[PDB]
Amino acid sequence: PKKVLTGVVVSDKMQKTVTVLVERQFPHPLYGKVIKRSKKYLAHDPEEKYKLGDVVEIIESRPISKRKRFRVLRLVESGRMDLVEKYLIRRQNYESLSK
Amino acid sequence: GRYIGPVCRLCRREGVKLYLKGERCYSPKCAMERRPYPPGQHGQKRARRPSDYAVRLREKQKLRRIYGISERQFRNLFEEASKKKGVTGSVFLGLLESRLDNVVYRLGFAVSRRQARQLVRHGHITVNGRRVDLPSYRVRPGDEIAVAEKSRNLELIRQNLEAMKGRKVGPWLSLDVEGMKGKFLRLPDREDLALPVNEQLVIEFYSR
Amino acid sequence: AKEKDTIRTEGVVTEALPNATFRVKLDSGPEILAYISGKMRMHYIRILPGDRVVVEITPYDPTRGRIVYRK
Amino acid sequence: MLTDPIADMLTRIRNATRVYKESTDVPASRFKEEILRILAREGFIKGYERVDVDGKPYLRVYLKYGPRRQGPDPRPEQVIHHIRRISKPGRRVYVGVKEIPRVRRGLGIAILSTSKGVLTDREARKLGVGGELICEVW
Amino acid sequence: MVKIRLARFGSKHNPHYRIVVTDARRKRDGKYIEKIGYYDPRKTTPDWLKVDVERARYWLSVGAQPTDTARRLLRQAGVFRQE
Amino acid sequence: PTINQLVRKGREKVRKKSKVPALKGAPFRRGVCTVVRTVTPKKPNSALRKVAKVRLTSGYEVTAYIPGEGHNLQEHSVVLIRGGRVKDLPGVRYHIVRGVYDAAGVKDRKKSRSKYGTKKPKEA
RNA sequence: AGCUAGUUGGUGGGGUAAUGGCCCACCAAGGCGACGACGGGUAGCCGGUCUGAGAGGAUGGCCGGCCACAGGGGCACUGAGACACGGGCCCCACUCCUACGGGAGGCAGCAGUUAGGAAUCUUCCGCAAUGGGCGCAAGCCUGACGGAGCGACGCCGCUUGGAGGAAGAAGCCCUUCGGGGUGUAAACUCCUGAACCCGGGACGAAACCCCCGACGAGGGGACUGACGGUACCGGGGUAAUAGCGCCGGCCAACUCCGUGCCAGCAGCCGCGGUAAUACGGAGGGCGCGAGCGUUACCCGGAUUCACUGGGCGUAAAGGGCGUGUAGGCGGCCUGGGGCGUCCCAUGUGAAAGACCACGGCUCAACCGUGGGGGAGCGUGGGAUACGCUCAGGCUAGACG
Ligand SMILES: [Mg+2]
Ligand SMILES: [Mg+2]
Ligand SMILES: [Mg+2]
Ligand SMILES: [Mg+2]
Ligand SMILES: [Mg+2]
Ligand SMILES: [Mg+2]
Ligand SMILES: [Mg+2]
Ligand SMILES: [Mg+2]
Ligand SMILES: [Mg+2]
Ligand SMILES: [Mg+2]
Ligand SMILES: [Mg+2]
Ligand SMILES: [Mg+2]
Ligand SMILES: [Mg+2]
Ligand SMILES: [Mg+2]
Ligand SMILES: [Mg+2]
Ligand SMILES: [Mg+2]
Ligand SMILES: [Mg+2]
Ligand SMILES: [Mg+2]
Ligand SMILES: [Mg+2]
Ligand SMILES: [Mg+2]
Ligand SMILES: [Mg+2]
Ligand SMILES: [Mg+2]
Ligand SMILES: [Mg+2]
Ligand SMILES: [Mg+2]
Ligand SMILES: [Mg+2]
Ligand SMILES: [Mg+2]
Ligand SMILES: [Mg+2]
Ligand SMILES: [Mg+2]
Ligand SMILES: [Mg+2]
Ligand SMILES: [Mg+2]
Ligand SMILES: [Mg+2]
Ligand SMILES: [Mg+2]
Ligand SMILES: [Mg+2]
Ligand SMILES: [Mg+2]
Ligand SMILES: [Mg+2]
Ligand SMILES: [Mg+2]
Ligand SMILES: [Mg+2]
Ligand SMILES: [Mg+2]
Ligand SMILES: [Mg+2]
Ligand SMILES: [Mg+2]
Ligand SMILES: [Mg+2]
């Protein structure tokens, strides 16, 4: 399988490049408790079609850049600005966390 | 290797008869029969309350001395028994019995366990057609054990055989009294043996 | 064995330290922190700076002795 | 927040057992109902029903006890000695066919939510399936 | 090159060889591709040597090469046998 | 606490304090001696205890206890550390082994032998 | 606590077996971060190993995988493959020769010297086996490997006799002076016959070669041994190394003399300052045993970092409270999706080990054969109770 992953477009600030947030849920190896664990990904998109706030299917791919190893297969749900915004807020807070 | 040296002393220390001389430990002389008390000075001192570890330890010592063994060997045997499926105490005992010297003793090819071991060592006993010289030989059931052909002629063995002529041989074994031979048939049980043991205690001691 | 090389020398009590460790200016020469004997401790016997006590001194290092005799 | 419902129910049951009132009231779920059914089947409670308190559905619990006891500490013999919700919300545990824990060696029971409905230990073993370890009772 | 060879396991004086399929540049003890048979030199057992024939044949077909001892063993146990 | 807390932080592992800087966990250490002297114990006990100030091939300046009843230790005596607190003496953590180097077997010991490193009397 | 400027993305090119910010030219100005970045320290990593009831924890020696580095650093070349352990160049650091201009080197290969250090091995024999590599082949090479050497370094196996033998010698020790202990131990009788010498003596090794068969299959023949005259078998054949720890409690095993908080012992409580079951000695005993104890270090016991499985009024311990962000967590009903989760199938989980069974070395360790298990992960299918998710409603929560 060319591994198949579900996640949201958090950023377009780029030519052809999309930023994806996969919230993979996993069990902890020890305490049982399952954690929402987020990893950022960078996908090539030859259209700029996919906009700020879309859940998309990200596929394991041959690399195009120093960490950019996925093509977008297809759109799932368009326009859920909720999950976008959370991440943005977290990022903002990160600036506030320092000092 | 061997304990070697003063024997009936161990019996005395234990307080229950060993039959470890064989005869003599059978005659009024094991010291158990004439003298029945701890060895050394305080041999006649009013009994100290044995701490609960102590009783167990004593039992273990009794058992280990009974068959005449190194302790490391014994430990290994115990471990093996534990590893095996079943009743560890019984199975362990059986395995212990299943050692060659013990077998020799119990079939009465020699009248004492030490003696049996000695015999085994020098090139006397023959396992299914070949001589074996190792006390720690594990003899698996349905096995035939003989006296050696050119060692067939010694007087001591004959005498021992005669002593074992008439009286019963342990249920799990059987002997030929003419062709200087014997079969080990079944792997011996708990109730099949009249030992002074309480193997449970030994097992408990080992746990720690 | 009990190796006896112990020097049984007298001395005037100099400096009262803690634990009843009395600097004793000996008849031998230099003062050391020589402490009080167990016997003395048992019998409750107070030494003051102004007594000629016997200090049982060791040959390994003359830095520590033992006040044995009462004054 | 009445946060976990199942756990709350279990707690209520335990309380009832402790203070000996043959019936108790708890809010109404399908899950809860299923659990109660299982309990009834096993024998930990005489029964139940679902009535109404304040225009809100409610599951009554017809408890069980053992015979009135002898001697000091009269306290009627307790059948639910102990209860404990294992899959505490957030600390969610999941077990398989080779992981159903033999509870009390067989004299209490575990409760395992499976693909095949809401069901019990022996049943699970028979059906060879695993699930969620909601609860332990003995 | 891909080689069919014995590998020494066992003990001192008491040898034991595995008829194996492995790579040229490998340790004689190394991570081989495939265990295909076994042989003990000491003839100690009635079932001293045994190969699995089909797998050996398959290996040969791909183009594996037997070293000399291995080849001999194969011959003995009938793999180069043609009917 | 709650498992969530654990997940967030983790349990602060028991960082095992070293009882002995014989360095490296060096099971022995050989070194040379500054001063052979004698020390008062404590509040419970009183006895002139035979000690050695010892410099080590590790590079530390540590005191060390001498065993037996009659020692033969000088100063630039080459000595071997055993390690293992005596209770009484404070700052004191290491024994010396008698039996090798500039600590030889205590003579007139026939019972407790090996611990003091003294050879066997040839029996008649 | 912020880091980052080839740094993140772009177009083109170059480079490469091949993607690529690998690198370059130029444009964009991002990217990662408290779901722990960067920095510091530490550290090969694993199959494993030890432990542990397990979960774990620690460890990663050998043995197998894989990385990385062959004085330190940096680079290429050649080739199928290196940025090249016993191949190159160059700078630095060092030891060697120098007719002072300059070169030689690299044992983290085996063996050993040297140093550190508590501590670690023979400047060993062999190409016989297996593997390597060349060669048509014979053959040649092989400190891979096989073995021997040394070390109780670890594990296992065996010897240091056994059968008699006094209501109890001596020796030595206590005594309540009768006696007891040591102790069937001894001596002495009988027997055996490790050591030891002689007689033989391997299995490991049948190929590659040669001929008949086509140089195929198949058939016959020959040569081949470091271990090693070893193992082992045949005959004889001597009673033929016992030690160390502890002896107050834990903890198995107690008395006497010496000594007088001294000398000392100690793992902790602590013993010792005149009758010390704790110190020195002597017997006795106990523990194991060709070993036992000390020390280091790890796990256990510590459910004393607690997931199984601990707590927080007074013992360590609730922050001074509020608001509030991320986060965590969530009522009832119905439906779908099926991500978690479960199940079934398989693919994988190399071998070695660990586990069972059986077999082999006279047993065992060791070693082989065969099985089984194996957390986890991939794929195909399903299940839908439970979390998640999307949709609709509900009023028990909340708010008005
Ligand atoms: Mg041994
Ligand atoms: Mg003195
Ligand atoms: Mg540039
Ligand atoms: Mg390109
Ligand atoms: Mg870069
Ligand atoms: Mg560093
Ligand atoms: Mg590690
Ligand atoms: Mg390795
Ligand atoms: Mg390299
Ligand atoms: Mg270099
Ligand atoms: Mg370099
Ligand atoms: Mg080439
Ligand atoms: Mg090239
Ligand atoms: Mg190089
Ligand atoms: Mg070397
Ligand atoms: Mg040297
Ligand atoms: Mg040195
Ligand atoms: Mg070696
Ligand atoms: Mg040679
Ligand atoms: Mg070859
Ligand atoms: Mg030539
Ligand atoms: Mg070798
Ligand atoms: Mg040896
Ligand atoms: Mg005798
Ligand atoms: Mg010979
Ligand atoms: Mg003798
Ligand atoms: Mg001592
Ligand atoms: Mg003690
Ligand atoms: Mg004493
Ligand atoms: Mg040891
Ligand atoms: Mg807890
Ligand atoms: Mg607590
Ligand atoms: Mg407090
Ligand atoms: Mg607050
Ligand atoms: Mg929130
Ligand atoms: Mg939520
Ligand atoms: Mg395996
Ligand atoms: Mg296997
Ligand atoms: Mg066998
Ligand atoms: Mg809704
Ligand atoms: Mg209101």
Swiss-Prot record, chain B:
Example GO molecular function: rRNA binding
Cofactors (names): Zn(2+); [4Fe-4S] cluster
GO cellular component, one term: small ribosomal subunit
Co-factor note (free text): Binds 1 zinc ion per subunit. In a number of structures (e.g. 4Y4O, 5FDV) a 4Fe-4S cluster is seen in place of the zinc cofactor.
Keyword RNA-binding assigned: yes
Domain of life: Bacteria
Gene3D superfamilies: Ribosomal Protein S4 Delta 41, Chain A, domain 1, RNA-binding S4 domain
Keyword list, A-Z: Metal-binding, Ribonucleoprotein, Ribosomal protein, RNA-binding, rRNA-binding, Zinc
Residues binding Zn(2+), per UniProt: 8, 11, 25, 30
GO BP terms: ribosomal small subunit biogenesis; translation
All copies of domain S4 RNA-binding, residue ranges: 98-160
Cited InterPro entries: Ribosomal_uS4 (IPR022801), Ribosomal_uS4_bac-type (IPR005709), Ribosomal_uS4_CS (IPR018079), Ribosomal_uS4_N (IPR001912), S4_RNA-bd (IPR002942), S4_RNA-bd_sf (IPR036986)
Family: Belongs to the universal ribosomal protein uS4 family.
Quaternary structure annotation from Swiss-Prot or TrEMBL: Part of the 30S ribosomal subunit. Contacts protein S5. The interaction surface between S4 and S5 is involved in control of translational fidelity.
Free-text function comment from the UniProt entry: One of the primary rRNA binding proteins, it binds directly to 16S rRNA where it helps nucleate assembly of the body and platform of the 30S subunit. Binds mRNA in the 70S ribosome, positioning it for translation.
NCBIfam families the UniProt entry points to: PRK05327.1, rpsD_bact
The name this protein goes by in its record: Small ribosomal subunit protein uS4
Organism: Thermus thermophilus (strain ATCC 27634 / DSM 579 / HB8)
UniProtKB/Swiss-Prot annotation, chain D:
GO aspect biological process, one term: translation
Signal sequence extent: none
Superkingdom in the source lineage: Bacteria
Record InterPro entries: Ribosomal_uS8, Ribosomal_uS8_CS, Ribosomal_uS8_sf
Keywords: Ribonucleoprotein, Ribosomal protein, RNA-binding, rRNA-binding
A Pfam family: Ribosomal_S8
One Gene Ontology cellular component: ribonucleoprotein complex
One term of GO molecular function: rRNA binding
Disulfide bridge partners, by residue number: none
Function: One of the primary rRNA binding proteins, it binds directly to 16S rRNA where it helps nucleate assembly of the platform of the 30S subunit central domain. The combined cluster of proteins S8, S12 and S17 appears to hold together the shoulder and platform of the 30S subunit.
Similarity remark: Belongs to the universal ribosomal protein uS8 family.
Entries under PANTHER family matching the protein: 40S RIBOSOMAL PROTEIN S15A
Subunit structure: Part of the 30S ribosomal subunit. Contacts proteins S2, S5 and S12.
The name this protein goes by in its record: Small ribosomal subunit protein uS8
Name of the coding gene: rpsH
Swiss-Prot record, chain E:
An example Gene Ontology CC term for this record: small ribosomal subunit
GO biological-process terms attached to the record: translation
Described purpose of this protein according to its UniProt entry: Binds to the lower part of the body of the 30S subunit, where it stabilizes two of its domains.
The protein's assembly and partners: Part of the 30S ribosomal subunit.
Protein name: Small ribosomal subunit protein bS16
GO molecular-function terms, A-Z: structural constituent of ribosome
Pfam family, any one: Ribosomal_S16
Keywords assigned: Ribonucleoprotein, Ribosomal protein
Family the entry assigns: Belongs to the bacterial ribosomal protein bS16 family.
Swiss-Prot record, chain F:
Region (Disordered): 105-124
Modified residues (3-methylthioaspartic acid): 88
Keyword terms: Methylation, Ribonucleoprotein, Ribosomal protein, RNA-binding, rRNA-binding, tRNA-binding
Keyword Transmembrane: no
The keyword Ribonucleoprotein appears for this protein: yes
Post-translational modification remark: The methythiolated Asp-88 contacts a modifed residue of the 16S rRNA close to the decoding center, and might be important for decoding center assembly.
Subunit text: Part of the 30S ribosomal subunit. Contacts proteins S8 and S17. Interacts with IF1 in the 30S initiation complex.
Name recorded for this polypeptide: Small ribosomal subunit protein uS12
